[model samples]
Target chain A: LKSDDEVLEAATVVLKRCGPIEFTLSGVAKEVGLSRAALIQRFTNRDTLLVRMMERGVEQVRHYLNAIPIGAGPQGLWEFLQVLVRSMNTRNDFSVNYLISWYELQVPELRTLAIQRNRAVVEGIRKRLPPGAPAAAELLLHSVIAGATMQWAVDPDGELADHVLAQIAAILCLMFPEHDDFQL
Target chain B: KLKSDDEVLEAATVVLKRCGPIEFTLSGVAKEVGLSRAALIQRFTNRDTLLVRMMERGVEQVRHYLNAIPIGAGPQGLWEFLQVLVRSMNTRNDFSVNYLISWYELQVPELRTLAIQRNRAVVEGIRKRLPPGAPAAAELLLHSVIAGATMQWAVDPDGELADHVLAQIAAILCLMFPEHDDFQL
Candidate 1:
């Protein structure tokens, strides 16, 4: 990678592939087109690189949420939620990766950033709902999206998207009981 | 008189809850119900049969529990409903949370099938309490909270498991229905 930006972005992919448990500086070095020494020289060590990765992870979620067009009303909200689940399923191993990072690695900051990410999603969804949307509604929506992934890990009936969308549909039905036309 | 099969099974569940899926033994359940180890074996045939019966009955009781809730009582009704959904996981040390994940890992097909039925029944109970044009997502959220909060408490476990989860759920309900100050957030 030519720049720090390039290295950080590449490292994110490597982390996803390797997971927090098996993540190695050498693996990241190879992925970013650097030798082990070269990577260490830039980032110092494994923990430093992971710390850098953690910062970037939070930024990535911030940027992702900001960039969304976030159309209005229930349909628009559904689209926004659909995009989140896709990214979540693809980006984070909600079941294994997070628990390892938070519990095993003892990274206190990651837990804080996780809270930020969750609340950010909550607010992101909250604003898109109809006027006076209950605070509970959006918060619960985020929880369902997250919980579906956990439940799916336990009983993986189909694709991650299938399980996520099924739970989302079930929740969306209650959120907007008037609309029977949801495209789920 | 000896405990009936129904009484024995109920006591077995308590033992399972106390000792968890791995540590809990038939001998434990026998003691809980005041029967001997051999007597429990005769009644359920084996350890697996006894456990399978417990899983079956646990799932079967989902509707029975839901049916008993007073939906007409408003927030109190919702509170009771939510509590019932998560009652099994409301443990003192939160061991039941670990037990839940371990039980799932067993991949017992019948139990897995029962999980689906239980979740559906849970959602059904939530759906009954909705007002006109209420956010349907509330149902999913309540359902999701059971899974989400348990995982949250599992990773951090800062407070009492059931107390922490029920408190947050109550807050959500309070915000969702501001008029019903009875949610006691």
Candidate 2:
């Protein structure tokens, strides 16, 4: 009996609070004052609802990346990287969801979509890199960021994130001395 | 009485290899050494103290291996360190990995402190040999990578520890120490 917008609002709240791991259609239905059957009518199943929520989360990240002004230079790239790291670190729900999704990408059916979305994020990062940097280096940088972020989230007290980020910044500087102006 | 610390350590190593982290108890060590738990307790007051001694023995083994290798700075030192580290890690069946995980779960502050101090000693050895101006952050990264790789190897011995991880680690080290161009291989 509830509106589509209300269901979506509930889904967003559940995704933000419990993450993709525990997110369920029934949970959202209860949150939105809808019956389970009503929520199922709105979205086919739990997986379908989760897939939609993840797609929205990815889009939100993309929007944040796109919002950074074009050609903002090294300082801008550094700021963007910091924002990305901070956002990922603070949003445990998103962080855990993204990691679970990343792991699930090993499955054949989901692999293509996950890779496509990941490629888009990497492309966004590539756009921010200094001009003339090798494309492979940028890809490797993304890997480091992803790998380090996962490890840091798993054990925050270990301080792996700061170490990895500092090393990445140093590598960037070595590769492009002109970008050295941006301090962490 | 055992002839030397090595004999006691050897017994402890056998116990660790057979029972893993969970079963590495004082009684286990005593049984492995063919001595009563009281006999082992007389030498080391408790299980934590005994585990520390075992870890110290492992560290000494690493020190011996590292010393045997020619001293070199930067990339050369890192390569040698990795070789020794991986080799040392491989000698026991899941002991290092289990110990690393178990150490984190320990409730005793004294035992944890001792474990940290032991880790610091190995790191200090590596740091001493690195070329000047090497990032202090290398210690944390090296520890994380080593621990991460070991965990992967433990969980999926046949699946996870692949060339990609080795390459990624090399790449990270290369990035971390720009002075070490030799590792470009």
Candidate 3:
């Protein structure tokens, strides 16, 4: 019998390689050199495995955001934005997993959990924004980032990453002049 | 050939207006024009070629729409241009949206270049009429926001389609140009 840790590690690899669509117990078993039945004994089914993987990804993002020093100013904000993009655009199975997880949120129960996770991330960002900015402004910023990232994923050759990043920087600077300014 | 391309364009418009994007195929165009597929293919080699021709027709429609409005010069011109632009787009929502999405999917470099050039020409037209010191990023923001809103509307018009987008776009224009008071609120 494979160890639980070994099974999870294999599952992550499979998720990263194949994304959410093909990440199955049998796939993970084949990846980990275990039988499908033995893999099922470890992780039950695809949904259970997916939920755990998504939780792990969200936790990773949370930890990364928490590590950013508060009041890093414009450069800090830029760095944070880049990191956010990078994490979301990770080339592994996680990118597709993240997208699938996002799509899954159309379901009520799953969406509730996803929204809770998002709220935590938003709060972390809110702390970094200038004082007196409206909560809705933060939501707008979040939407722009999410929208831009999704667009980039869909049309990677659109040559929009730099343009979008610059636009966000400009908006943040204008919206919060007290923090710091960067040339748009 | 047949009355300066307008006849073919009108036929193209009919096809797009009725079918939306997915149903717009060569067979569909031929059916719409009451001609055989071979006859339609003779004029435009294939679907991609036909779509390009349709887009050019659409651009001419835009030009015709622009010509109807008096150019007021300065920020007024910017405002007026935006009004005409948005109205024309809204009037042909399905065709415009489908063409825009289809344009993006085309792999031809020249087609892509033409799309960008068309956008640039419109932006330049706006720039020519805007007052001094207006942020150049306005063009990018305006275009992106309009595209984003159109995309939302196309996916589920009943859900997020809003008359407010025009107002918001007008607001963005006023904010960008600085010379004009908020007019269409």
**Residue B89, candidate 1: how far off, in angstroms?**
3.8
What overall lDDT, based on C-alpha atoms, would model 2 receive against the true structure?
0.59
Q: How close is candidate 1 to the true structure, as a TM-score?
A: 0.63
Q: Report per-candidate DockQ.
A: 0.20, 0.08, 0.13
Q: Residue B36, candidate 3: how far off, in angstroms?
A: 2.8
Residue-wise lDDT of candidate 3 within B50-149, one digit each (tens)?
Answer: 8778767666665555556567766666666666665655444333344334334333554555555456555555555565655656555555545544
Query: Model 3 chain B, TM?
Result: 0.71
Best by lDDT: 1
Please identify model 2 stretches exceeding 4 Å from their true place: A1-9, A19-21, A89-112, A132-135, A157-168, A178-181, B1-73, B80-129, B141-162, B166-184
Query: Model 1: per-residue lDDT, tens digit, A85-127?
Result: 8875543443455434343324566656655656677777787
Q: Model 2 chain A — which ten-residue stretch has the worst lDDT?
A: A91-100
DockQ preference between candidates 1 and 2, better one: 1
How many clashes show up per model? 8, 0, 1
Model 3 ranges off by over 4 Å? A1-79, A85-128, A134-159, A177-180, B1-4, B13-23, B62-70, B73-80, B91-106, B149-184
Better model by lDDT, 1 or 2?
Answer: 1
DockQ of 3: 0.13
As a whole number from 0 to 100, the lDDT of residue B170 in candidate 2 is: 71
Query: Which of the two candidates, 2 or 3, achieves a greater lDDT against the reference?
Result: 2
